Amino acid sequence: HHMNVVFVGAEMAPWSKTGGLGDVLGGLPPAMAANGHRVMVISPRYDQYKDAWDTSVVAEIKVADRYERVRFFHCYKRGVDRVFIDHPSFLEKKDNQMRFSLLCQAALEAPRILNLNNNPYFKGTYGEDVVFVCNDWHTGPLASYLKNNYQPNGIYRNAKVAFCIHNISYQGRFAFEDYPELNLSERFRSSFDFIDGYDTPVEGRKINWMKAGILEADRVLTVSPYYAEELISGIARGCELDNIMRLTGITGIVNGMDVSEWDPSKDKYITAKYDATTAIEAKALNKEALQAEAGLPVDRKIPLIAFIGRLEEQKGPDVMAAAIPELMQEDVQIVLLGTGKKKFEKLLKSMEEKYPGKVRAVVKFNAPLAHLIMAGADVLAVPSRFEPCGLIQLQGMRYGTPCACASTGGLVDTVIEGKTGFHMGRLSVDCKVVEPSDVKKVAATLKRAIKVVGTPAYEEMVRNCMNQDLSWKGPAKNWENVLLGLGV
């Protein structure tokens, strides 16, 4: 009931973040520290972090053949031992495999070779009764290293690794010849061993870090229970793949969210701040600011739909694009915000040119415009092909923006029909195609949604979205339970 938890990952908010990996390692650890657990978080050191200080400790790392010197940097924040791994590989201005062999390996050193006394309830070295939590493919090998170098020599013999899937898209697939360079024994190859692109003209044998992580761990997790059930069922498409393997007993837990970065009553990028009681009036003001900034007609009576996402197949921008003409029979505005694959940037931009004064694609990275979007939109459209958990819909609800979303993964868990958003049904997993029947669903659900905007019932929805606890308090008790089931 009083465990040492060590999280490892390639990202760590606020220091580093791109997807929901950063977010999770930002907020979940402290929430577990608040519950009376000693909690560390190791991730690389990509820049010279102001708040992070040199601890003078060093291990030397066996990667390929090059012996490598890493420095440990520290930072005790929100009841959390936050540890960064220093090396010129990370400090940048195939090589990716060396970088993260570094991370995995170092992470195995920090629980033993560091004196951390900052905590009023725990002292000195973390020890060897550790629960490791590995996040994404970048830390897949950790369990293997631990079995390779520590458990035969009688170290960490009680320990347990849990492995968490944040997104099945990126698996760490490497040429199989490169295996030796992990300096892991032969008994662990078969865990990495992978047939990529089966029965397609680019079928090739590969080393797969995510697969290693999953097979070698004592407990496998992902970021949503429905998605767990999607994976256990073999709906498991990473888009540019099928199934991976026969997954089993995977446990899903819905992510919380950084409720301080995203907080309509304190946000500083938006025109009007608010809570549930003042949301209707303030969102109207944000909506008119937003119309102004997007060069669309400024009018609060026009319902405004927003898409915000990486322009990748996963998030269905092509499906979003296809539905615009249908939606354009209605009196609505659409604002899209994302970057990625240019054939998509090209699609949305063509959509702006065809319907000016009605559609605005902002292909650009713009954190501040995203808050404004979130505060001013009436509906957020999330036509995803797959969605492990999602952050966008959580962010929406936090800002009282209900979500019209595809019925997959985390969206099924977090978005309730008629209470906090509208389900479109499940879209075709066949990423390359845009099924016309899917285009039909998306437009239909968006027509329902906007037809509700303005009615009193819509305002209840807004209130519903804003009354939810979307912090980590609730999810952290779910994690705690899973980690306690692990014996140690």
Swiss-Prot record:
GO biological process: starch biosynthetic process
Known outcome of mutating P317S: In strain: cv. Rexmont
Chain residues that bind ADP-alpha-D-glucose: K17
Catalyzed chemical reaction(s): an NDP-alpha-D-glucose + [(1->4)-alpha-D-glucosyl](n) = [(1->4)-alpha-D-glucosyl](n+1) + a ribonucleoside 5'-diphosphate + H(+)
Residues annotated to bind ADP: G20, R310, K315, K364, Q395
First-listed, main subcellular location of the protein, grouped into a coarse class: plastid
Keyword DNA damage found: no
A cellular-component GO term for this protein: amyloplast
Keywords, alphabetical: Allergen, Amyloplast, Chloroplast, Disulfide bond, Glycosyltransferase, Plastid, Starch biosynthesis, Transferase, Transit peptide
Presence of keyword Plastid: yes
Location(s) in or outside the cell: Plastid, Chloroplast; Plastid, Amyloplast
Enzyme Commission identifier(s): 2.4.1.242
Metabolic or biological pathway, per its Swiss-Prot or TrEMBL entry: Glycan biosynthesis; starch biosynthesis
Function: Required for the synthesis of amylose in endosperm.
Family from the record: Belongs to the glycosyltransferase 1 family. Bacterial/plant glycogen synthase subfamily.
Protein name per Swiss-Prot or TrEMBL: Granule-bound starch synthase 1, chloroplastic/amyloplastic
Whole sequence portion shown: 83 to 586 of 609
